Design a protein around this nucleic acid. Structure first.
Ligand SMILES: [Mg+2]
Ligand SMILES: [Mg+2]
Ligand SMILES: [Mg+2]
Ligand SMILES: [Mg+2]
Ligand SMILES: [Mg+2]
Ligand SMILES: [Mg+2]
Ligand SMILES: [Mg+2]
Ligand SMILES: [Mg+2]
Ligand SMILES: [Mg+2]
Ligand SMILES: [Mg+2]
Ligand SMILES: [Mg+2]
Lengths: 154, 215, 305, 53
RNA sequence: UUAAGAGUUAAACCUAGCCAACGAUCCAUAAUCGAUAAUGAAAGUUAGAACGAUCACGUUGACUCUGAAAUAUAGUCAAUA
């Protein structure tokens, strides 16, 4: 769901503007993969499963009985009076989905504007969806995998 | 879950011992993972210091080495596995002792055997009200194993002109608790448990002022 | 803001005062005369520093800023001069301190406004003969001659060819007296290349910068990964920069045709492939266009490609 | 005309052989590369992981 | 009928459909295009003179013969001069 991912991107920007250390996002496979990619890339300090009330201290198993009250809790990073995660935007919008082949992805990573997408920036992460796996654009290039260019985060 | 967890605090790297049921007893898997990851951190230019702590925060930091397996590796004559175990543990101790970046050890809880080895070789070792420090190898037919015979003759403050207080601690295996460990020099700082969170944030923030040399 | 600015000298000079109604003079002309000094009956300016060529392998480039635009000297004693109030040329009242301690880099700088233009070093005939002998007789590869003498390889090959031409000309007594005097006066004007010095020997590790690399690209990786020149070369899809130096240091079927007595030309047929050979149909015509292709024949005649 | 017809036959069959070899050489080079991006790198110890979750 | 499908053209019978506000029908305007030319950072925009490709026409309209292929710059009839 790109609408929910857009909501998460905007919510992360909102939480970085006010400098809250911990916030929540919807509990879904796409949301969890996105948060994990941010966490492994150093944009998030922590990623926990939890409820609508807070992160879970101990493991709580997710079932249809509690699926509606699950959340993913993410810790935001700040350093030198600046947020680490300043901007977070979608490339492939719900009303214009952008699927690129590996060659155009390499062009985008090499400074070429492809389909009006500004190229990758020095400290930016572009995520790509392939076979319902979110992954870094450079990783998709290494694996020679075409995919949907999903979002930028800087 | 993995027996050791590695996390990040904005410049510091946090290593959490993650075996609560066995009181963070140290293994060869644990020692190898810690040794390799510290080798990685020694090269990183975005790492400033390492924090050593435990998830089982109040009760134990590291309740010795897991020498029961070492004893079963010798009841079944698998002496090579015991050799690997001690090689990993002592190479890790040697790494921690000679590390060129600050290492900070939170000795919040029981600290024995391998725990002393993890904590005694760093200039920054923090005791709390919960610190229960001991060296109980004499009663299991074993020796001070983790470089304690090197450290204690040097770091202990009182009655240690000829290593005799170090000998008392080693031979008797007396449990030294809390501020007594700080006063004897077994711990370098004394911080209440409730503060160790805030300290952990602070240690994650400070960087060298300029020329970015954390060594 | 901009107006026309007559290029008066930037340094002080004595301007015209009251002028006889028929002088018809300009301040620029007087400035040039003062710069040049008096002209002989032979049409010479002996008093100007730059009139005569140097002889000690130290180029005599202009220094209008160091010497305050005072270009006059005694031709024999080489001591500075200045124009006194009475129209004579005499010693300066005070001595310049900017003309004695001149940075050695400035002495090889032809133009005072361009620090990046420097004269090259002439090679002595002995060194050129040494290189020619090494390459042609001892058969040493140009790479090791370049390394030994600190000269770029194309320069070494050019030296070989030029020395060969010189040898032919000397064998034919074509180098006249005037040519030898011109060559030796030119040779004594420039600094002499010194093989031994580290700062006078050419850098031997230069490669062209291709367009592909010029764009800055950045990779975010785990904090401890090694990333060397080979990994960078892989990322940019190029050979590593060392094979570029290594490679810079270093079939079609044809049918010749039957010639018979009286035939003025021969046919050679080079094998080709349909879809690649031929003049294309509806190709761009540039003859009326500003970028029309001009080439030169094997006889040097300008032709239209 | 026989030479042209038979050389064309030969060229087509040779092209098919070459394309099969190219496919089975790429299918090996690609797998070698994917696997060589599976050798555990020591630096991977510095990437934060939450494998259990 | 045609070498050949088809309301293509001719004849008969039926069914009541078909297109259209994502623009039908009607009207006006225009030969069309390129690895051609112009322009621009580029997407594009412009031209369609030159080079090349395709179409249509040879004063206007319809028909016919021959022919593999023609409503042919042919022939017949008519119009205009
Ligand atoms: Mg003006
Ligand atoms: Mg029909
Ligand atoms: Mg009908
Ligand atoms: Mg209409
Ligand atoms: Mg028209
Ligand atoms: Mg048009
Ligand atoms: Mg035309
Ligand atoms: Mg024309
Ligand atoms: Mg016609
Ligand atoms: Mg006419
Ligand atoms: Mg007509």
């Amino acid at each position: 769901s790109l609408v929910k991912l857009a909501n998460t991107c905007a919510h992360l920007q909102n939480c970085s503007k006010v400098r809250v250390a911990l916030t929540s996002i919807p509990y879904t496979k796409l949301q969890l993969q996105f948060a994990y990619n941010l966490y492994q890339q150093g944009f998030l300090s922590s990623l926990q499963k939890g409820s609508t009330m807070g992160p879970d201290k101990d493991f709580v198993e997710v079932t249809p009985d509690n699926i509606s009250t699950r959340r993913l809790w993410v810790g935001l990073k700040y350093r030198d009076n600046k947020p680490v995660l300043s901007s977070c935007k979608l490339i492939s919008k719900p009303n214009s989905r952008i699927h690129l082949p590996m060659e155009d992805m390499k062009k985008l990573c090499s400074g070429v504007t492809i389909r009006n997408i500004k190229p990758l920036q020095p400290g930016e992460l572009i995520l790509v969806r392939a076979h319902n796996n979110i992954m870094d654009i450079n990783e998709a290039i290494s694996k020679k995998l075409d995919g949907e260019v999903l979002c930028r985060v800087k | 879950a993995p027996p050791v967890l590695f996390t990040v605090q904005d410049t510091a790297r946090v290593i959490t011992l993650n075996r609560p049921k066995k009181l963070n007893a140290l293994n060869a898997e644990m020692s190898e993972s810690m040794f390799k990851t510290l080798n990685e951190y020694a090269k990183s230019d975005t790492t400033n210091l390492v924090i050593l702590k435990s998830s089982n925060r109040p009760r134990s930091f590291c309740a010795g080495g897991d020498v029961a397996t070492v004893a079963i590796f010798n009841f079944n004559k698998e002496f090579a596995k015991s050799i690997k175990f001690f090689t990993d543990e002592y190479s890790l101790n040697f790494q921690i002792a000679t590390y060129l970046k600050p290492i900070v050890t939170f000795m919040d809880g029981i600290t024995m055997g391998g725990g002393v080895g993890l904590s005694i070789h760093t200039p920054f070792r923090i005791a709390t009200e919960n610190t229960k420090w001991a060296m109980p190898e004499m009663d299991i037919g074993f020796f001070p194993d983790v470089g304690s015979t090197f450290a204690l003759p040097r770091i202990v403050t009182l009655a240690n002109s000829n290593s005799q207080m170090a000998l008392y601690l080693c031979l008797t295996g007396e449990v030294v608790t809390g501020a007594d460990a700080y006063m004897l020099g077994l711990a370098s700082h004394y911080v209440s448990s409730e503060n160790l969170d805030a300290l952990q944030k602070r240690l994650g923030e400070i960087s060298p002022p300029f020329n970015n040399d954390p060594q | 803001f901009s107006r026309r600015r007559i290029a008066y000298p930037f340094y002080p000079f004595k301007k015209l005062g009251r002028q006889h109604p028929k002088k018809h003079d300009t301040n620029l002309k007087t400035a040039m005369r003062q710069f040049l000094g008096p002209k002989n009956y032979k049409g010479e300016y002996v008093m100007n520093k730059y009139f005569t060529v140097p002889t000690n392998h130290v180029p005599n480039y202009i220094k209008p800023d160091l010497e305050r635009g005072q270009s006059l000297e005694h031709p024999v004693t080489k001591k500075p001069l200045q124009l006194r109030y009475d129209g004579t040329l005499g010693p300066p009242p005070v001595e310049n301190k900017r003309l004695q301690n001149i940075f050695k880099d400035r002495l090889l700088q032809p133009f005072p406004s361009n620090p990046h233009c420097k004269t090259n070093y002439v090679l002595s005939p002995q060194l050129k003969q040494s290189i020619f002998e090494e390459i042609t007789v001892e058969g040493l590869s140009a790479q090791q001659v370049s390394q030994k003498y600190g000269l770029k390889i194309p320069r070494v090959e050019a030296i070989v060819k030029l020395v060969s031409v010189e040898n032919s000309w000397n064998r034919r007594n074509r180098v006249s007296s005037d040519l030898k005097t011109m060559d030796e006066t030119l040779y004594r004007m420039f600094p002499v290349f010194d093989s031994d010095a580290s700062f006078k020997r050419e850098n031997l590790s230069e490669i062209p910068v291709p367009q592909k690399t010029l764009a800055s690209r950045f990779l975010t990786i785990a904090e401890s990964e090694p990333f060397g020149p080979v990994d960078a070369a892989h990322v940019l899809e190029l050979e590593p920069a060392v094979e570029t130096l290594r490679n810079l240091s270093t079939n079609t079927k044809v049918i010749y045709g039957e010639l018979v007595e009286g035939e003025r030309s021969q046919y050679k047929f080079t094998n080709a492939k349909v879809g690649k050979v031929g003049y294309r149909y509806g190709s761009g015509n540039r003859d009326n266009k500003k970028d029309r292709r001009i080439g030169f024949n094997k006889l040097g005649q300008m032709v239209y490609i | 005309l026989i030479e042209a017809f038979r050389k064309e036959e030969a060229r087509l069959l040779h092209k098919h052989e070459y394309l099969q070899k190219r496919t089975k050489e790429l299918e090996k080079a690609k797998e070698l590369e994917l696997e060589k991006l599976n050798k555990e790198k020591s630096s991977d110890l510095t990437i934060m992981t939450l494998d259990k979750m």
